[PDB]
Design a protein around this ligand. Sequence first.
Ligand SMILES: C[C@]12CC[C@H]3[C@@H](CC=C4C=C(C(=O)O)CC[C@@]43C)[C@@H]1CC[C@@H]2C(=O)c1ccc(O)cc1
Ligand SMILES: [Y+3]
Lengths: 224, 11
Amino acid sequence: LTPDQQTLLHFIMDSYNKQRMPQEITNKILKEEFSAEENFLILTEMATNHVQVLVEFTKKLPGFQTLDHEDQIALLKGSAVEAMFLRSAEIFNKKGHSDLLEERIRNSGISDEYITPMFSFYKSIGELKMTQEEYALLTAIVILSPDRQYIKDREAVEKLQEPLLDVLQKLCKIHQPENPQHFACLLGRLTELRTFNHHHAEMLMSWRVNDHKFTPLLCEIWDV
Amino acid sequence: ERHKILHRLLQ
Ligand SMILES: C[C@]12CC[C@H]3[C@@H](CC=C4C=C(C(=O)O)CC[C@@]43C)[C@@H]1CC[C@@H]2C(=O)c1ccc(O)cc1
Ligand SMILES: [Y+3]
């Protein structure tokens, strides 16, 4: 990596290394009652909090916070789902504690057709043996995607994402010189990740029908 | 937006 690239990675890692489930939440995962409604509530709190952590992490991505203070909204709005599912893949592969979180996820009003692809994606991520740098850079890349629905200035976003893609590529060559297609593999996983925008929207539909309540922030980002 | 809160915490 060049020094500018090491600098970029060092700051992304400093911030990404601050992400961790709050203890009060962890405690609830262990002791709260077990029911569809309760499980949804626990998940809704973890999600609301994670959107807040994403906001902060994004605010630190270089150049981001100098973009049209609205094309910014397009990005966070557009990437929240993908970032959360990537984060969850990371945690289910690290581990149990998460053993319990899974049992709650499996009885939270999520239809079996979406449970299936969620756990298969986790297994597929587990397979790539990703490093923290890879999870951090991929999340940054997910957030800085130039294809979001409301992107006016797609070219500017493109400019800020490029350097990250470049850093990831070099990292893959450095830490897996004997697995040259690793990088391509990570990019393919980003593709499977995008299908969660649809899975998640179907989950929102089932939950709404089933009369669940979200959170002011989540209602905003997902238009409920 | 409209997405007041998101605009908010995005200081
Ligand atoms: C994505 C998700 C909310 C965010 C959770 C994720 C599973 C594990 C996690 C671990 C985290 C950590 O250890 O830092 C941060 C929260 C996340 C990333 C849940 C799986 C399904 C759920 C969901 O989509 C959902 C969405 C809206 C809701 O109201 C409730 C659930
Ligand atoms: Y079904």
